[PDB]
Amino acid sequence: LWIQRINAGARLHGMNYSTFINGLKRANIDLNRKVLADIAAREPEAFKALVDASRNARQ
Amino acid sequence: KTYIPKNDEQNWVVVDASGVPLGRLATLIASRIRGKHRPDFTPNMIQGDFVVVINAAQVALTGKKLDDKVYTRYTGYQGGLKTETAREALSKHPERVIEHAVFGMLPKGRQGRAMHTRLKVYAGETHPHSAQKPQVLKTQPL
Amino acid sequence: MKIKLVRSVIGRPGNQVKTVQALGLRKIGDSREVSDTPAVRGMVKTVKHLLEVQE
Amino acid sequence: IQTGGKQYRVSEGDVIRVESLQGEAGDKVELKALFVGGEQTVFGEDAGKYTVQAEVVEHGRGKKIYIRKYKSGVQYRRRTGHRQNFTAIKILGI
RNA sequence: UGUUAUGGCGUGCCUAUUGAAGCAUGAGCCGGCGACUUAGACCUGACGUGCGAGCUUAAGUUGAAAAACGGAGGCGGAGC
RNA sequence: AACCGAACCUGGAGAUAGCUAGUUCUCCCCGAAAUGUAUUGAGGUACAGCCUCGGAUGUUGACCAUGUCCUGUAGAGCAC
RNA sequence: GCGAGAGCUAACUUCCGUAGCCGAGAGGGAAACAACCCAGACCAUCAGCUAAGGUCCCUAAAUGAUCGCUCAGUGGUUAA
RNA sequence: GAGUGACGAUGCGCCGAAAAUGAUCGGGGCUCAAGUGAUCUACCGAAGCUAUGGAUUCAACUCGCGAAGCGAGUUGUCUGGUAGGGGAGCGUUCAGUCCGCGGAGAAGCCAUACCGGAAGGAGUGGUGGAGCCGACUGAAGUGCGGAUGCCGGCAUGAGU
RNA sequence: AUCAACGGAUAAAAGUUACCCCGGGGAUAACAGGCUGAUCUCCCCCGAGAGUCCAUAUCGGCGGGGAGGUUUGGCACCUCGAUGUCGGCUCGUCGCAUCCUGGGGCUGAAGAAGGUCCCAAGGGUUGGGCUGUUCGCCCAUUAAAGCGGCACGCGAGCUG
Ligand SMILES: [Mg+2]
Ligand SMILES: [Mg+2]
Ligand SMILES: [Mg+2]
Ligand SMILES: [Mg+2]
Ligand SMILES: [Mg+2]
Ligand SMILES: [Mg+2]
Ligand SMILES: [Mg+2]
């Protein structure tokens, strides 16, 4: 359920779960994992920030 | 703990079928019908959008429309109650080709069946505008 | 010589289970520093395919 | 979470797995992994600068569960009790 | 706490068996009844206690709101 | 005397039953076998093997290396 | 599975050898599915990483990147 | 007027290719790869590994005690299981002992969201209307879903 | 001591049961199904030779590759606390490897009548004599008087 909500929002900001998570992993600093689904669902402002950070640590 | 929903929204989408490969189009509709990007993101109920298909007759099929694509639909006690039709032969029902490809990629239970109410297929372009008094937010395939 | 059990002992021949026991590895992930002696290098070659070898 | 919080909570008295600092106001400081304090959003190690402050409210046993196990035609039936121990913590930090 | 919608998951029980949801056996349901015991101065072992290089009584006898007596005999004690 | 290749009733009698069924509170620790040889034996049984508990011993057990000996399969070959 | 006999170089066949699993083994995968593949379940959690297997929708996760092949739905019924 | 004909190797494909209830690769659908050869990463994915909390087994190490040993307490380790073996206990009747309770309400019955690791145990309330709980120790006709089990009551078929 | 049934039951011992009885076994046969497919049925390959001449209009030695699952079997997996067993009748439905009828190609097709192969399962596929018969033989017709599956389809449907 958690993963489903993540890639839904990840795809809202031109990404996807696979990619997004790798970004947060590549930005070692980011280790949300648990909680991460609620941010996507309730805090869209905040979720976007984490998408933008994930995009950096990758490409 | 995890977040649940509301229902104040009922998004209506207007996908065009024109030249899109059948299954390729189908996928987009089935996902937007279930809960792809999902409002509150929950599976105990329907969060899905009301897809409206237009240009059903102008849909695309690869190497075989004449051969291979055969809609088997076997009637009452099969006392040779075995009916088959080529996809080309579905010039009678273009709306049922899209319809009975999309339902094929949907859950099949009590809820799943409830989901075929959301899909509303039409063969025309300007004439489908029947169920088009609510929202008409056009979303292209890819 | 760093050695770690990466594959399960289930479905693997007796001798290989007995070797993996001698090497003191009890779970998957279990890692240990190893001797460069011919017999201890010899144990590690018997069950090579079940272990991840660093050096 | 995995034990020991994070996040932009408020002044909430939540329940977590046992902390050892027995009795009331045993004071606990939390690492923090994200925050929305004053709408300002910041994540990992940049959030690590900041910390959360907690006060050990109580020590308790979680609602009794019963661990039941069954294997068919083997006459295998198991019945055992269970109660998970927790530490309730009042949040009141940065 | 009760109840309810929808989602996921999900092959009664026992027996017998290489293999039971099995279209193999049994059983309508509930209540009650319903299956490893007792004996012997028997044999052999674990635990235990009392005396201990020794230990012990049987039948009986006398007292019985109760136990004492009774050494006939039995076992260690030498084997081949 | 409503079921006769030897009536019915009571008893011996809880006949025998290597066969079928059934065998009831709980948690914990270990945990098999379906093999070998014999059997008027082959769906039974004796001894071993395999399990478990207690005692003794206390590295003798396991794997792997080295050293040594044993061996006629795979392949090959046509000297029998 | 591997190594043989029997058998038609048949059998979900039979009888040995040898390894592993089921028997007594739950969990993931293989649609479903004792045995195959991964992996051996002390209990709790609305945490994290991986195996075999996967990442269009049903269904978790790239409708991934690059150079090629096939146009028969081959893929997704065997030979001379 | 510019290349063209034959033996062979190989990759993927073609024909050869007919069985009985209705079809299909699980399905939808797929060549505008969701097929397929090769290389490469990123994610999913189990009761495996990991995080945190707790319990058990064996062990070595501390100690409460007149000693062994039993309790506690670390640390390590263990904990799938059929036949079977080993350990610790729960419950029922009767008994001896002690502490009690009861017509201002005993047993039994009924309801319940409480306690204990389990067998189980308590509180409160309701019924009942005269006996009974707890603790230690002793003894058993001591624990049932099965036996086409026995006795009894009541269902189904059926308003047939 | 051919106690040789050779770890040797007594010194001493054959048959029969359709009159049969009990305890069991799907540990084990007969029916059906399942797996297999030797045999069975069909189809394909090669082309010796027959066809006055010409391998292939028809035919196809010796030999080779498949398919089917209707035969006889093999095997012994569910069923022995019961899966009624041949034929008929009644009732159907389904495969096509098509008996008729429909469309074709080749012919050793002048025509008419055929032969043979391909496509095709819509409907059709007679009544008697003999035998329990399925089968088969005969009589008399027919466009034709098909071969198979469905527990050798069908007994809580009938016969016996
Ligand atoms: Mg039986
Ligand atoms: Mg009797
Ligand atoms: Mg071949
Ligand atoms: Mg009963
Ligand atoms: Mg048969
Ligand atoms: Mg018969
Ligand atoms: Mg013709």
Q: Is the CB of C9 under 7 A from strand F?
A: no
Q: Which chain B residues are within 8 Å of A38, Cβ to Cβ?
A: 2-3
Q: Which chain B residues are within 8 Å of A2, Cβ to Cβ?
A: 2
CB proximity B6 to A under 8 Å: no
Phi, psi of C3 (to 5 degrees): -130, 135
CA of C28 to C1' of G51 (A): 11
Instruction: Select from D28, D69, D35, D63 the least CA-distant residue to D49.
Output: D35
Strand, coil or helix: what is A34? coil
> Cα–Cα distance between B128 and D86 in angstroms, integer?
61
- Nucleotide showing the shortest C1' distance to residue C43 CA: F64
Method in brief: X-ray
**Cβ burial, residue D39 (10 Å; 0-12/13-18/19+):** exposed
**Cβ burial, residue A56 (10 Å; 0-12/13-18/19+):** exposed
Q: Would you state the structure tokens that stand for residue B132, as one six-digit string?
A: 């088009």
Q: What's the start-to-end Cα distance of chain B, in Å?
A: 37
Q: Would you state the structure tokens that stand for residue C42, as one six-digit string?
A: 């010899």
Phi, psi of B13 (to 5 degrees): -110, 150
Q: Is the CB of B107 under 7 A from strand E?
A: yes
CB proximity B37 to A under 8 Å: yes
Q: Would you state the structure tokens that stand for residue D74, as one six-digit string?
A: 């083997």
> Cα–Cα distance between C43 and C48 in angstroms, integer?
8
Provide residues 17-56 of A with CB closer than 7 Å to any strand H atom: 17-19, 21-22, 25
CA of B14 to C1' of G63 (A): 21
- Contact yes or no for B50/B120 (Cβ under 8 A): yes
- Contact yes or no for C54/C1 (Cβ under 8 A): yes
Residue D50, number of CB atoms within 10 A of its CB: 17
Q: Do chains C and D touch (3 or more CB pairs under 8 A)?
A: no
- Contact yes or no for D65/D82 (Cβ under 8 A): yes
> How many domains does chain D fold into?
1
Instruction: Select from D52, D34, D51 the least CA-distant residue to D43.
Output: D34
**Helices in B90-142 by DSSP H: which ranges?**
94-102, 110-114
C11: domain CATH number is: 3.30.1390.20
| Residue B74 alpha carbon to ligand 3 centre in Å | 40
> Cα–Cα distance between D55 and D73 in angstroms, integer?
52
Could you please report the per-residue DSSP string of A1-59?
-HHHHHHHHHHHTT--HHHHHHHHHHSTT----SSHHHHHHH-HHHHHHHHHHHHHHH-
DSSP letter at D72 equals: T
Q: Is the CB of B41 under 7 A from strand H?
A: no
Q: Which domain holds residue B109?
A: 1-142
CB proximity B41 to A under 8 Å: yes
* Of B3, B37, B43, Cβ closest to residue A42: B3
Instruction: Select from A1, B3, A34 the least CA-distant residue to D3.
Output: A34
> How many domains does chain C fold into?
1
CB proximity A40 to D under 8 Å: no
Q: Which domain holds residue D32?
A: 1-94
How many alpha carbons lie under 13 Å from residue C14 in its C-beta half-sphere?
A: 0
CA of D20 to C1' of I21 (A): 81
CB proximity A53 to D under 8 Å: yes
Note the resolution in Å, 1 decimal: 3.2
**Min distance D20 CA to chain A CA atoms (Å):** 24
- Contact yes or no for B97/B57 (Cβ under 8 A): no
Q: C-alpha angle A40/A10/A43, rounded to 5°?
A: 20
- Contact yes or no for B141/B28 (Cβ under 8 A): yes
